[PDB]
Amino acid sequence: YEHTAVMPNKVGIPYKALVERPGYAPVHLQIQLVNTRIIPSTNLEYITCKYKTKVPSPVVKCCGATQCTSKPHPDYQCQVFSGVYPFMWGGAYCFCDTENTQMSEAYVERSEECSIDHAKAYKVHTGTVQAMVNITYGSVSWRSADVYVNGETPAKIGDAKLIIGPLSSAWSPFDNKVVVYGHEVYNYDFPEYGTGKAGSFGDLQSRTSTSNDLYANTNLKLQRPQAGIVHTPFTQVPSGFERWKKDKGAPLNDVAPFGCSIALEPLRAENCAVGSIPISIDIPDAAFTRISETPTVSDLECKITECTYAFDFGGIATVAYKSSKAGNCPIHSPSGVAVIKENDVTLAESGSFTFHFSTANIHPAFKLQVCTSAVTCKGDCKPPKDHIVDYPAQHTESFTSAISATAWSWIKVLVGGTSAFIVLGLIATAVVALVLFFHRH
């Protein structure tokens, strides 16, 4: 039998519902979420790491000149310095005074630390949503399996078949372009593999972690050797990967709203709480019993002994029944004023039991069913002494839930007696026209 309703998108709290079938006793249905993962689609664009500029050995032409060719290398540089006359150990290097050549070639290559700490530049495309759902009904225990959040994939959980409907909102915490460094992600823009400002983020881009091709602009410039010694001096701006690692903002896992914990290896956004989830579960007829088998109850009167405004289950009430025979029947409340802690009851012949509930109202006028029979409960509640708790609310706060009976009588005369006084004022005009008409004829 198909049960169709709307479940709010929360993880900790369960969803309680009583399934009504004509000619059959109702059953208790519990749906509880464990995980809620939003998994977008990503393609890796490029990686970034600190560079390492390695220079080859320069040549020392004694009496002559040298030229260079445009070798294929990232950020390759060449120059020619004329008239160097270098000095080494054991006297001078060459004969020809005030005419000599030094090569001083340099180019840029990635570091050996690029395989350990590198930033992965991802482009985010919208994808699929999945969840893990705990299911029980009737008398069988809790058992769970992974489900898909769409409108086309039923999942076989238990003896029933469950279709978890799509999310009400398409909100995702990820941007179009993200950067993954270590175990945290960031919302950052890219130089898009073509550009690079040589000191901010894209001074060294490689397509994969072991790609042969490498883009690198770093403002590398050759400098003249001085006073006749053999070395190749260069000048370049510092790395952009180090400058990004200092001038960095907060990661997305410290920034994302709705309590979205972010994992890494499929790049999920776990346990967000936004929107609602429609449900459709088809419970088989093997868990349905008849009206003749279940007992009937009567003479139900309810008294609330203690209620509290606080979170968790701060209310406790005892009810009195008169059952036809012993057995088990579920209890459930349709209205959202009070949730119920437990599902079933061990009934007896003319006894009484207590149950625990949870409201967000001063005066709960909630109503619950026991053994497909009706009873109502009324009472009063007191504010709690706790200021801050470490657990979320089990109830749902409404708009009229904060109105006390003293203030409700105060606003029943400012809108009731005043608006009816204008009615008293308006009928005086309606009767003075009748008297003035009767003066004529």
């Binding site: 410290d254 002494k385 200021h387 609310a393 006390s404």
Partner: protein, 105 residues
């Protein structure tokens, strides 16, 4: 292996969380709210200070140093009596609803 900061002294108020932080090293404190607006704050603490954060019913999550994050939710304790004279009925709803009692009156 990294240092662990001493735990803060936590005292509660009405929709207000107070932390007494006493660091011996420059220590990072990041907070965020679990509602629609995250409102993220971050600062480095080098001296013994005290900070106040407005915790609502949706919640608040704060991390201090290398400690795991903690989540706290504010209840509805209130500062008034809802039944009685209207000089104390109004002051009960002013603390609970300061945005509707001024407009509604």
């Amino acid at each position: 292996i990294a240092t662990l900061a001493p735990e803060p002294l936590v005292e509660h108020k009405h929709r207000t969380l107070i932390l007494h932080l006493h660091p011996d090293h420059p220590t990072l404190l990041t907070t965020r709210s679990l509602g629609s607006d995250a409102n993220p704050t971050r600062q480095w603490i080098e001296r013994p200070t005290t900070v106040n954060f407005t915790v609502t019913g949706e919640g608040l999550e704060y991390t201090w140093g290398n400690h795991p994050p903690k989540r706290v939710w504010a209840q509805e304790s209130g500062e008034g009596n809802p039944h009685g004279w209207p000089h104390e009925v109004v002051v009960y709803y002013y603390n609970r609803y300061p945005l509707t009692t001024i407009i509604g009156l």
